[PDB]
């Protein structure tokens, strides 16, 4: 971002984006996501441009560090592949997590016990999580969304282009968001690698934890 | 078929302004529309524009900052004498403080307050406010 | 969209559109010269020609009228002029 | 080196010579 | 607004959109005001100064808030020029 | 859309911006005019002369190289057809439809197509009498079908 060379992409970040499958989008295109695709392959997959992913991710990290209080940035994940990344990001940065089922009224019903009033909203996937995206329209929330190529851009303000479908690329995108916020705010220096692996943010399947528990 | 080209141009401006778009493309291009959009530009309502020259009747690409609530046409062009100008600016305009009626007079195409200051009347073309 | 520039269109979206719907309309035909391989008349054909263009050495046909582009006879050689 | 054995030294004429005006690779061939 | 003694007689002056310049009313409950933080050019850390953009809710409802945030951040030196 | 059909189709030939004779076009104005004369001696209308010079001689637009049009060139030599071309083809199609309809009187739709073609003939004749290309006593009468052409 910023036309600055300290904030540019390095080859280590690009090897993570290549190895996770962030650049492999979907097979359909919502018509205002086509400023992010490079080209469509013979397979039918659209390729997400990674520089647009990086500049929208750094603009999202600028929007996340711009709140003085870290406790009223709230992160939503309803699908199962982003719950552990939301809980790890919320333990890392000090945000508030909402993982799992999002009971409606938690931004507009004042007398229910889970009534919050955050100042920004980061969601996992803007089609499956459209219930807090619609409930952001009565409370004046700007909304940041990790967006696939086939995902509707109603009521989101900052769309971070990725493959939000797989486990690896969701866990990586929440990891890169945590890393850019903690470097920008001042916690980690820019020159060392961050000591937290992205495998702390990945999804652990019940079949995957049972194959890890029975060792050879 | 297509009659009264200025009307269909101003309906193009209005439909693409109500959606908050930033640039329109007007076709055809009269010399009526270039003086009309000169009048709306000089009051600070649309900003710059371009007259695209093919060797047929050209196109016009207008910049838009939305400042423009309504841009309309009056068809047919009724003869407005100088005593009928207050009856016409009471009908079409939203206020005594703003809004303009463009009318085509023998000193040129001009708005309705300049036609009182130049002491002339003529046929009406439309309005913008 | 909705910030979209109409005064500077890209050539991908200027070869995309219909020939009447560009900023300046411009035809999608071109002028060829057909070389017949056993004679030395360079012969000038339209791309979309509607008559059978007869050459004057060995009186052969160069091109066939079809609904679109004229299918040149197979084994001649062509290039676009200009 | 080899082509410098085959030129003439005073004998130059091109009256038996054929100048091609369309010698090019610019033509495509139609299938 | 302003009467002949020079007084400003209005109750308040409402915000306007950064994307469409429509008046964000009192009850446009879907409109946002978003801060986007600046960084220092030598270290890449947040130094306290802001960029502020406001979008009315009617632009947000049709899916056009993202592209206008991208254009407004591009023109004030946050997004690169590629 | 079209005049006597419900169709709204858009199919035209769109002339380019650049109005100039090209660098390879070696036919001068006088050579193009003599090509037009020896092509119009074979019985040809303006349209077929325009087709032949487009296809086989490489002049795209004849009024771009000479400076004036094909029918001005044919009328300045007395080779102009006496009826115009379009009115000739509409009259010839009307004689063809009436020659079909003298045998088949259960042909309820070709009678209707005769009504449309004769309407287009009267619209062109009423245009041409106001540009004085025709005499003002020109009446198209259905007895006078094979007396015209």
Swiss-Prot record, chain A:
Q: What is the effect of changing residue 53 to N?
A: In ICAS; reduced protein levels
Question: Which superkingdom is the protein from?
Answer: Eukaryota
Q: Where does the secretion signal sit in this chain?
A: none
Q: Where is this cross-link: Glycyl lysine isopeptide (Lys-Gly) (interchain with G-Cter in SUMO2)?
A: 88
One Gene Ontology cellular component annotation? plasma membrane
On this chain, the residues bearing N6-acetyllysine are 51, 88
Record region (Interaction with PPP1R16B) = 53-112
UniProt-annotated stretches for the region Laminin-binding: 160-179
Using the record's annotations, give every residue carrying the modification Phosphothreonine: 96
What's an example Gene Ontology biological process for this entry? cytoplasmic translation
List the subcellular locations. Cell membrane; Cytoplasm; Nucleus
Tell me the impact of changing residue 179 to G. Answer: In ICAS; reduced protein levels
Keyword set, alphabetical order? Acetylation, Cell membrane, Cytoplasm, Disease variant, Host cell receptor for virus entry, Host-virus interaction, Isopeptide bond, Membrane, Nucleus, Phosphoprotein, Receptor, Repeat, Ribonucleoprotein, Ribosomal protein, Ubl conjugation
> What more does the record tell us?
This protein appears to have acquired a second function as a laminin receptor specifically in the vertebrate lineage. It is thought that in vertebrates 37/67 kDa laminin receptor acquired a dual function during evolution. It developed from the ribosomal protein SA, playing an essential role in the protein biosynthesis lacking any laminin binding activity, to a cell surface receptor with laminin binding activity.
Protein's name according to its UniProt entry: Small ribosomal subunit protein uS2
Whose protein is this, by species? Answer: Homo sapiens (Human)
Curated annotation (Swiss-Prot), chain B:
Task: Name the protein family.
Answer: Belongs to the universal ribosomal protein uS8 family.
Under what name is this protein listed? Small ribosomal subunit protein uS8
The listed locations are: Cytoplasm; Nucleus, Nucleolus
What job does this protein perform?
Answer: Component of the small ribosomal subunit. Part of the small subunit (SSU) processome, first precursor of the small eukaryotic ribosomal subunit. During the assembly of the SSU processome in the nucleolus, many ribosome biogenesis factors, an RNA chaperone and ribosomal proteins associate with the nascent pre-rRNA and work in concert to generate RNA folding, modifications, rearrangements and cleavage as well as targeted degradation of pre-ribosomal RNA by the RNA exosome. Required for proper erythropoiesis.
Report the disease annotation for this entry: Diamond-Blackfan anemia 20: A form of Diamond-Blackfan anemia, a congenital non-regenerative hypoplastic anemia that usually presents early in infancy. Diamond-Blackfan anemia is characterized by a moderate to severe macrocytic anemia, erythroblastopenia, and an increased risk of malignancy. 30 to 40% of Diamond-Blackfan anemia patients present with short stature and congenital anomalies, the most frequent being craniofacial (Pierre-Robin syndrome and cleft palate), thumb and urogenital anomalies. DBA20 inheritance is autosomal dominant.
**MF terms in GO:** RNA binding; structural constituent of ribosome
Spans through the membrane: none
- Signal peptide limits: none
Positions carrying N6-succinyllysine are 87
Q: Does the keyword Ribonucleoprotein apply?
A: yes
Under the heading PROSITE patterns, the entry gives: RIBOSOMAL_S8
Tell whether Calcium is among the UniProt keywords.
no
Curated annotation (Swiss-Prot), chain C:
Q: Which GO terms describe its cellular component?
A: cytosol; cytosolic ribosome; cytosolic small ribosomal subunit; GABA-ergic synapse; glutamatergic synapse; nucleolus; nucleoplasm; nucleus
One GO BP annotation here? ribosomal small subunit biogenesis
Against SUPFAM superfamilies, the record matches this protein to: Zn-binding ribosomal proteins
Return the cofactor note field: Binds 1 zinc ion per subunit.
The molecular function GO annotations come to: DNA binding; RNA binding; structural constituent of ribosome; zinc ion binding
Which keywords accompany this UniProt record? Cytoplasm, Diamond-Blackfan anemia, Metal-binding, Nucleus, Phosphoprotein, Ribonucleoprotein, Ribosomal protein, Zinc, Zinc-finger
Name the positions where Zn(2+) binds: 36, 39, 55, 58
Q: Report the Pfam families cross-referenced here.
A: Ribosomal_S27e (PF01667)
Which Gene3D superfamilies does the record cross-reference, listed alphabetically?
Zn-binding ribosomal proteins
Q: Where is the composition biased (Basic and acidic residues)?
A: 1-15
Where does it live in the cell? Cytoplasm; Nucleus, Nucleolus
InterPro entries, alphabetically?
Ribosomal_eS27, Ribosomal_eS27_Zn-bd_dom_sf, Ribosomal_zn-bd
- Which sequence positions carry the modification called Phosphoserine? 10
Q: Which cofactor does it need?
A: Zn(2+)
Tissues with expression: Expressed in a wide variety of actively proliferating cells and tumor tissues.
Q: How does this polypeptide assemble, per the annotation?
A: Component of the small ribosomal subunit. Part of the small subunit (SSU) processome, composed of more than 70 proteins and the RNA chaperone small nucleolar RNA (snoRNA) U3.
Tell me what this protein is called.
Small ribosomal subunit protein eS27
Naturally occurring in which organism (per UniProt): Homo sapiens
UniProtKB/Swiss-Prot annotation, chain F:
Query: List-wise, which residues carry N6-succinyllysine?
Result: 26, 33
**InterPro entries, sorted:** Ribosomal_uS15, Ribosomal_uS15_arc_euk, Ribosomal_uS15_N, uS15_NS1_RNA-bd_sf
Q: Where is this cross-link: Glycyl lysine isopeptide (Lys-Gly) (interchain with G-Cter in ubiquitin)?
A: 26
> Is Ribonucleoprotein given among the entry's keywords?
yes
The UniProt record lists the keyword rRNA-binding: no
UniProt modification remark: Ubiquitinated at Lys-26 by RNF14 and RNF25 in response to ribosome collisions (ribosome stalling).
Family matches, as SMART domains: Ribosomal_S13_N, Ribosomal_S15
Q: Which GO terms describe its cellular component?
A: cytoplasm; cytosol; cytosolic ribosome; cytosolic small ribosomal subunit; extracellular exosome; focal adhesion; membrane; nucleolus
GO term, biological process aspect, one:
translation
- For the cross-link Glycyl lysine isopeptide (Lys-Gly) (interchain with G-Cter in SUMO2), list the residue numbers: 42
Q: Which HAMAP family match?
A: Ribosomal_uS15_A (MF_01343_A)
Q: Indicate the quaternary assembly.
A: Component of the small ribosomal subunit. Part of the small subunit (SSU) processome, composed of more than 70 proteins and the RNA chaperone small nucleolar RNA (snoRNA) U3.
Q: Which family does it belong to?
A: Belongs to the universal ribosomal protein uS15 family.
Name under which the protein is recorded: Small ribosomal subunit protein uS15
